[PDB]
RNA sequence: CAACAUCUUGUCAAACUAUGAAUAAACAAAGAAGAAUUCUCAGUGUUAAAUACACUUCAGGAAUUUAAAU
RNA sequence: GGCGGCACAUCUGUUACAAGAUAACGCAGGUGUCCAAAGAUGAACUCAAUGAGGACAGAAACCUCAUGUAGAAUAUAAGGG
RNA sequence: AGGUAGAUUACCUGACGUUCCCAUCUGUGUGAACAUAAUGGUACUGAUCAGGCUCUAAGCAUCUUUACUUCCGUGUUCGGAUGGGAACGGGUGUAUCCUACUUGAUAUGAACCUACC
């Protein structure tokens, strides 16, 4: 019928497929070749970036520098090793996103060897104020760059919590404190969110509205016995237990490829069935 | 434990536009009715091309608004109750959506004035399944599979089950 | 009137098609390029005789319409409307220019206005080709020789051993027809395609 | 008669390669050019800022100075009857690493491998190896036998004419 | 009285009488416009070697 | 009838083009002075710090081999 | 020679001959301007068109879904991006 | 086997049906708070009731496309060179370079770094 199908072989010949990792919608190539172009007078000096990605259950943070063969990863601290440090549930919140940033910074500094002169902040009162690391003696801080990928930089985004842990952990990341959970109100608004403030105020409110909604939203919280008042002191102990020790099969074959001889023999059977049908 | 729970055709949108051919004055009242009917401020749509036969480029022409979920479920009943669920079989697009157009806004007769006039309306319903987000997310935006996508027949049965509407092939 | 044919015979200049840059070209004198019974199947007419041009020149569009008329009148009179298929295989895609000079006029300081249309041929390029049954071949070779008198230069009539406008010889078309590699389209054949999905 | 534009006669000289539009690679901005390297200039019409003159497209030059965002490249330009030295500053997007010395830099390795053995054979007293033979044009082939057990013959004669119509 | 506007006849055989004057090897060794950081390291060392060379000359 | 799709057919483009010769253009085939190897080695920077890297008469200096590279 | 025109300063495509230069009163055209945004930067989004649908509404008004390698737009002439 | 970041950017693309998901990724419930718009659809944030339904990924087909190889074809064209042929038009011979469309056979990936299984 009246088709005018614009898919014909005259249309594929002129086709120009995009870059592979852009065809999947995973890499913004226009704004990646700006985090990778190092000054040409620095010959093969690595340019580290912090690759922050949030899945449905895990907060991924890696420190990577590019190469012609492929991007190389220096250090990586996921958020599924938090159960080792105490945090058992809610591994994707704003508070657990600060821990993995702090977990990475202290894991990186221990690996390089600058964990003694770069301590950052350690107390709980100063968790809400921006801390930019400074030159120590004659040794500059480690310098990275946040690579948020395809995530909008809204005023309270989690990806700047991972940045928050880095600068408070010692590693220097260039930033401005106008996109944290603060950037307004006060520092305690940011401090509360780093310590599960926005989560504790939920169950102290849902438990007062409906006891079945509380079961639905926080089913695994109640069974573990984590009362809302205990979130501040489980995250604080997590930070204390990260600094003191941050230093870090089965295969299922699926389909296999059909060989040429089997491929050509199938057609002959299909042709024979077609011929024997008439 | 069958995965049939992940094919529940649901109403995820409903658009009501009042395409009046005049800019302002009359249009501003066409937004007021859509405010009471839906509860959210509507948008204004401007002309795409200027045609002398229609007295129309940047001038506001129509006003449409979208509702979803519970709020759009009840307004679908009102538009159907006017038609008494007698929707023609040619009202279903091959993409799985169906629509209909009413002429008089019934609204509320308690506070009604002749100043506003009588404005027609168009109802358009978009159906979906759990998993349609893969074509609307920002990261890894993809295309839904053809087996998961709705059909003209798939939309007919949904309308012939929940509302028990009778489809006329006239 | 019209300039002598010897003025625009040698092929000179870059090709000058009618386009948006060359506006105002008189239409070609020929409009019907295929004459005879164009809907006859391929197997009906096996005998094919060509006209081959042996000079590099511009066969003007006035020499195709004047030649198509001669073949049509001398083939309907001898064979019949249903007994032949003659196809002109040159189209007038070149525009000759003329600088009409009126001595109270400009000197050689201007370009030329469009004159007509001609087709650039070369050596060994078939101009006109036809197919007909065996019983009417002598009545078409005679008509083709009469049509050469309206062309310029040297033309050679070649009796091809191939089929009716196909590429296979008069016997290879029989081999491919009996095997099943030939499928008709009403006027031409189609090869049996051994590529693409297997049908049901 | 042409014009005096900077980028004149560039319908096919600046046109991108077929199905090569859009962004360049990521090794274009990641190769490391050091002073003294042989690089090839190749004007990139996608990036207008800093486009080198169309007369240097495809010329081969020596990197003389590496600046933070641009690579100095010097080439020889021909004038009325003298050859001058041109000193451009091309961004890495508009230049490509020339492999003119691809053959030469593999001859050096072969000689260096041999010379490494000669410093060990001499120390231990063994007869040192001879250097690789130099390159010569295709020399006249010598005389070689042909067996009569795996041979076959095909008569060659002028072909009888077959008509093409 | 018109004339011939231009002709490249003989203009290339003229240039090959005295052949293409290649540039001397001193033309390839200019250090003008080089990296300002590189030119400050090279200056800072040439001054250092010269100071230690002239002091040794004065000692003897 | 037509019109719209689709599979073929005949013929074209200086201001159309996928592919694309021959002839050409500009490089290399060993001149901080004809190569190389080993040891030692400093000044400024880059760097998170360098023993990495860059420039410094292949900074400099001392031994052994070496005239070879269409 | 005059009258006509600007080939007198200048740009795009072609004649132009796959490096550079390259003629005719050769061809098809363009400039003596326009812009506080039509400069700079960040973020979001995808365009012309077609198919299917929705009162008046139809070949053209507004809306939804699917396809859509740029067939849109980018101040202008053309060629590039 | 899976996720994150990649390099080469169709052997990677498009259409038709397919096979597992134990971990992982995705889809999935929701809107109090930063944040978001006409719509918690998008982005944002909080979470774990179910799911392999679409993703993603592994495979299929005389699959369009695309990437190598042969053939097409020494046929097109061309560098060099007559006191060679022709009234022209054009086209030999010699010493040489040598395409393209098509078609036929093959292929539908490779690899680099960190984590978990």
Q: Measuring CA to CA, how many Å separate A278 from each of A266, C194, C195, D117?
A: 19, 19, 21, 77
**CA of residue C153 to C1' of nucleotide F66, angstroms:** 78
Cβ atoms of residues D71 and D129 within 8 Å: no
Both tokens assigned to A157: 């985004």
Q: How many CB atoms lie within 10 A of CB A258?
A: 9
State the Cα–Cα distance between residues B122 and B19, nearest whole angstrom: 9
Both tokens assigned to B134: 């893969």
Rounded to 10 degrees, what is the CA torsion of A223, A225, A231, A236?
A: -120
Q: How many CB atoms lie within 10 A of CB A106?
A: 27
Rounded to 10 degrees, what is the CA torsion of C103, C107, C111, C112?
A: 30
State the Cα–Cα distance between residues D30 and A44, nearest whole angstrom: 9
Cβ atoms of residues D63 and D73 within 8 Å: yes
State the Cα–Cα distance between residues A158 and C93, nearest whole angstrom: 69
Strand pairing category for B98-102 and B121-128: antiparallel
State the Cα–Cα distance between residues C85 and C136, nearest whole angstrom: 11
For D93, residues 6+ apart whose C-beta sits below 8 A from its C-beta are D24, D28, D29, D44, D47
Q: How many CB atoms lie within 10 A of CB D95?
A: 25
CA A219 to chain centroid, in Å, comes to 25
Distance from CA of D157 to the nearest CA of A (A): 43
- Give C102: exposed, middle or buried? Use CB within 10 Å, 0-12, 13-18, 19+: exposed
Cβ atoms of residues B99 and B124 within 8 Å: yes
Both tokens assigned to B100: 């209909």
Cβ atoms of residues C18 and C25 within 8 Å: yes
| H/E segment holding residue A275 | helix A260-276
Name the percent of chain A in helix, strand, coil, to the closest 5.
40, 10, 50
Candidates A25, A149, A152; nearest CB to B141: A25
**CA of residue E43 to C1' of nucleotide F43, angstroms:** 9
Number of Cα atoms under 13 Å in the Cβ half of residue B66 = 6
| H/E segment holding residue A183 | none
Q: How many CB atoms lie within 10 A of CB B21?
A: 12
Number of residues that this document lists for chain B: 170
Method: cryo-EM
Q: Which three-class secondary structure state does DSSP give residue A53?
A: strand
Of all residues in chain C, the one with the smallest CA distance to D165 is: C160
Residues 9-38 of B near strand H (Cβ < 7 Å)?
12-13
Q: Measuring CA to CA, how many Å separate C106 from each of C101, C102, D33?
A: 8, 9, 65
Facing residues of C125 across strands?
C53
Q: Measuring CA to CA, how many Å separate D46 from each of D12, D16, D42?
A: 14, 8, 12
First and final C-alpha spacing in chain B: 41
Cβ atoms of residues B72 and B14 within 8 Å: yes
Strand H contacted by A34 CB (< 7 A): no
Both tokens assigned to D9: 């006669």
Q: Which bases of chain H come closer than 7 Å to a protein CB?
A: 1, 3-10, 12-20, 22, 24-30, 32-36, 38-39, 41-66, 88-91, 104, 106-109, 111-117
Closest residue to G78 (CA, C1′): D11
Q: Which of A13, A277, E24 is CA-nearest to residue D83?
A: E24
What is the experimental resolution, given in Å to one decimal place? 3.1
State the Cα–Cα distance between residues E5 and E9, nearest whole angstrom: 12
Cβ atoms of residues C130 and C67 within 8 Å: no
Both tokens assigned to A32: 């990646």
Q: Nearest nucleotide (C1') to the CA of residue A217?
A: H47
Strand pairing category for B43-46 and B98-102: unpaired
What's the 3-state SS for chain B?
CCHHHHHCCEEEEEEEECCCCCCCCHHHHHHHHHHHHHCCCCEEEECCCCCHHHCCCCCEEEEEEECCCHHHHHHHHHHHHHHCCEEEHHHECCCCCEEEEECCCCCCCCCCCCCCCCCCEEEEEEEECCCHHHHCCCCCCCCCCCCCCCCHHHHHHHHCCCCCCEEECC
Number of residues that this document lists for chain D: 165
Rounded to 10 degrees, what is the CA torsion of A226, A230, A236, A241?
A: -40
Q: Which of C142, C169, C187, C172 is CA-nearest to residue C47?
A: C169
Q: Which of C93, C109, C127, C76 is CA-nearest to residue C22?
A: C93
What DSSP string describes D106-142?
Answer: HHHHHHHHHHHHHHHHHHHTPPPPPPPPPP---PPP-
| H/E segment holding residue C94 | strand C94-98
For C95, residues 6+ apart whose C-beta sits below 8 A from its C-beta are C16, C17, C18, C22, C25, C114, C115, C116, C117
Distance from CA of D161 to the nearest CA of C (A): 15
Q: Which of D107, D59, D53 is CA-nearest to residue D83?
A: D59
Q: Which of D5, D12, D95 is CA-nearest to residue D56?
A: D95
CA B169 to chain centroid, in Å, comes to 22
State the Cα–Cα distance between residues A110 and B79, nearest whole angstrom: 67
State the Cα–Cα distance between residues E24 and E27, nearest whole angstrom: 6
- Nearest 5°: phi and psi at D63? -70, 120
Both tokens assigned to C8: 């625009």
Residue D163 at interface with chain C, using a CB cutoff of 8 Å: yes
For A157, residues 6+ apart whose C-beta sits below 8 A from its C-beta are A148, A151, A179
Q: How many CB atoms lie within 10 A of CB B123?
A: 20
Both tokens assigned to A22: 């852009």
- Give C194: exposed, middle or buried? Use CB within 10 Å, 0-12, 13-18, 19+: exposed
**CA of residue A83 to C1' of nucleotide G42, angstroms:** 39
For D69, residues 6+ apart whose C-beta sits below 8 A from its C-beta are A37, A39, A40, D91
Q: Which residues of A179-215 are buried (b: 16+ CB within 10 A; e: fewer)?
A: bbbbeeeebebbbbbbbbbbbbebbeebeeeeeeebe
Strand H contacted by A24 CB (< 7 A): yes
Number of residues that this document lists for chain A: 278
Q: Measuring CA to CA, how many Å separate C157 from each of A155, C139, C141, C142, D65?
A: 86, 14, 8, 10, 73
For A259, residues 6+ apart whose C-beta sits below 8 A from its C-beta are none
Cβ atoms of residues C60 and C151 within 8 Å: no
Strand G contacted by B83 CB (< 7 A): no
Subunits with 3+ Cβ pairs within 8 Å of D are A, C, E
Q: Which of D55, D103, D45, D47 is CA-nearest to residue D75?
A: D55
Cβ atoms of residues C163 and C44 within 8 Å: no
Q: Which three-class secondary structure state does DSSP give residue D153?
A: coil
Q: Which residues in chain E have their CB less than 8 angstroms from residue A41's CB?
A: 35, 37-38
Both tokens assigned to E5: 């506007």
For A87, residues 6+ apart whose C-beta sits below 8 A from its C-beta are A96, A99, A234, A235, A238
CA angle B134, B140, B145 (to 5 degrees): 40
Q: How many CB atoms lie within 10 A of CB C169?
A: 13
Which contacts of B97-104 are long-range, i.e. CB under 8 A and separated by 24 or more positions? B97/B124, B97/B125, B97/B126, B97/B127, B97/B155, B98/B125, B98/B155, B98/B159, B99/B123, B99/B124, B99/B125
Cβ atoms of residues A42 and D66 within 8 Å: no
For A61, residues 6+ apart whose C-beta sits below 8 A from its C-beta are A50, A51, A52, A76, A77, A78, A79, A100, A101, A104, A162
**Strand segments (E) across A34-151:** 48-54, 59-65, 72-76, 146-147
State the Cα–Cα distance between residues C26 and C23, nearest whole angstrom: 10
Torsion sign (Cα): A162, A199, A58, A239 = positive
Strand H contacted by B1 CB (< 7 A): yes
């Amino acid at each position: 019928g009246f088709l005018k199908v614009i898919k014909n072989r005259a249309y594929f010949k002129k086709y120009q497929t995009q870059f592979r990792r852009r065809r999947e919608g995973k890499t913004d190539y226009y704004a990646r070749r700006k985090m990778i172009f190092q000054d040409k007078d620095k010959f093969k000096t690595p340019k580290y970036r912090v690759v922050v990605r949030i899945t449905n259950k895990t907060v991924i943070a890696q420190i990577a520098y590019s190469e012609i063969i492929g991007d190389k990863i220096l250090c990586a601290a996921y958020s599924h090793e938090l159960p080792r440090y105490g945090v058992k549930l809610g591994l994707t919140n704003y508070a657990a996103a600060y821990c993995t940033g702090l977990l990475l910074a202290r894991r990186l500094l221990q690996k390089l060897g600058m964990d003694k002169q770069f301590v950052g902040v350690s107390d709980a009162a100063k968790l809400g104020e921006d801390y930019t690391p400074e030159e120590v003696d004659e040794r500059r801080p480690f310098k990275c760059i946040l690579d948020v990928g395809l995530a909008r930089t809204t005023t309270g985004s989690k990806v700047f919590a991972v940045l928050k842990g880095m600068c408070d952990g010692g590693v220097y990341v260039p930033h401005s404190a106008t996109r944290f959970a603060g950037a307004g109100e006060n520092e305690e608004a940011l401090r509360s969110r780093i310590l599960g403030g926005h989560v504790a105020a939920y169950m102290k409110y849902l438990s007062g509205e409906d006891a079945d909604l509380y079961k639905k939203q926080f089913g695994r919280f109640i069974a573990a016995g984590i009362a809302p008042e205990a979130l501040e002191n489980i995250y604080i102990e997590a930070h204390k237990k990260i600094r003191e020790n941050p230093a870090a099969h089965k295969k299922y074959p699926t389909s296999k490829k059909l060989t040429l001889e089997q491929r050509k023999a199938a057609i002959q059977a299909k042709l024979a069935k077609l011929a024997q049908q008439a | 434990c069958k995965s049939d729970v992940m094919r529940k055709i649901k109403i995820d949108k409903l658009v009501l536009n009042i395409s009046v051919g005049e800019s302002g004055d009359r249009l501003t009242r066409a937004a007021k009715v859509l405010e009471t009917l839906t509860g959210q401020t509507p948008v204004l749509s401007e002309a795409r091309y200027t045609v002398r036969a229609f007295s129309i480029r940047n001038d506001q022409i129509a006003c449409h608004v979208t509702v979803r979920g519970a709020k759009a479920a009840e307004i679908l009943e009102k538009g159907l109750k006017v038609k008494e669920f007698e929707l023609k079989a040619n009202n279903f697009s091959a993409t799985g959506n169906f629509g209909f157009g009413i002429e008089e806004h019934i609204d509320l007769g308690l506070k009604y004035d002749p100043q506003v006039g009588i404005y027609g309306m168009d109802f358009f319903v978009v159906l979906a399944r759990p998993g349609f987000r893969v074509s609307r997310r920002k990261r890894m935006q993809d295309k839904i599979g053809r087996d998961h996508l709705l059909t003209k027949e798939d939309a007919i049965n949904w309308f012939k089950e929940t509302y028990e509407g009778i489809v006329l092939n006239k | 009137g019209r300039r002598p044919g010897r003025c625009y015979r040698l092929v000179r200049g870059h090709p000058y098609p009618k386009s948006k840059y060359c506006r105002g070209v008189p239409d070609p004198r020929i409009k019907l390029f295929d004459i005879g019974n164009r809907s006859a199947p391929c197997d009906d007419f096996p005998c094919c005789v060509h006209i081959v041009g042996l000079e590099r020149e511009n066969i003007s569009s006035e020499a195709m319409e004047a030649a198509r008329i001669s073949i049509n009148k001398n083939m309907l009179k001898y064979a019949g409307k249903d007994g032949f298929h003659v196809r002109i295989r040159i189209h007038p895609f070149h525009v000759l220019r003329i600088n009409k000079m009126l001595l109270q006029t400009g000197m050689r300081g201007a370009w030329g206005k469009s004159y007509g249309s001609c087709a650039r041929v070369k050596v060994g390029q078939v101009l006109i080709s036809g197919r007909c049954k065996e019983q009417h071949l002598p009545a078409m070779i005679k008509s083709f020789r009469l049509a050469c008198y309206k062309f310029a230069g040297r033309q050679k009539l070649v009796i091809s051993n191939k089929w009716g406008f196909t590429k296979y010889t008069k016997e290879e078309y029989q081999q491919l027809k009996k095997d099943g590699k030939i499928i008709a389209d009403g006027c031409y054949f189609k090869l049996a395609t051994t590529k693409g999905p297997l049908p049901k | 008669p042409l014009s005096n534009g900077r980028n004149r006669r560039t319908r096919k000289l600046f046109k991108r390669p077929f199905r090569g539009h859009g962004l360049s690679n990521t090794s274009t901005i990641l190769h490391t050019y050091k002073v003294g390297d042989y690089v090839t200039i190749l004007c990139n019409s996608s990036i207008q800022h800093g486009l080198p003159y169309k007369a240097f497209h495809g010329k081969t030059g020596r990197v003389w100075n590496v600046n933070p965002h641009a690579i100095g490249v010097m080439v020889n330009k021909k004038v009325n009857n003298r050859i001058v030295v041109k000193r451009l500053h091309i961004s890495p997007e508009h230049i490509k690493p020339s492999g003119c010395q691809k053959d030469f830099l593999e001859r050096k390795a072969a000689v260096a491998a041999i010379r490494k053995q000669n410093i060990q054979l001499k120390k231990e007293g063994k007869p040192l190896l001879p250097l690789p033979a130099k390159r010569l044009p295709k020399q006249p082939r010598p005389a070689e036998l042909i067996k009569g057990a795996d041979i076959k013959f095909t008569t060659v004669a002028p072909l009888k004419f077959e008509e093409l119509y | 009285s018109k004339d011939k506007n231009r002709s490249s006849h003989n203009q290339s055989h003229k240039a090959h009488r005295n052949g293409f004057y290649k540039p001397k090897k001193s033309a390839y060794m200019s250090t003008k416009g080089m990296n300002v950081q590189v030119l400050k390291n090279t200056k800072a060392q040439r001054k250092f070697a010269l100071a230690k060379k002239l002091e040794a000359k004065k000692a003897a």
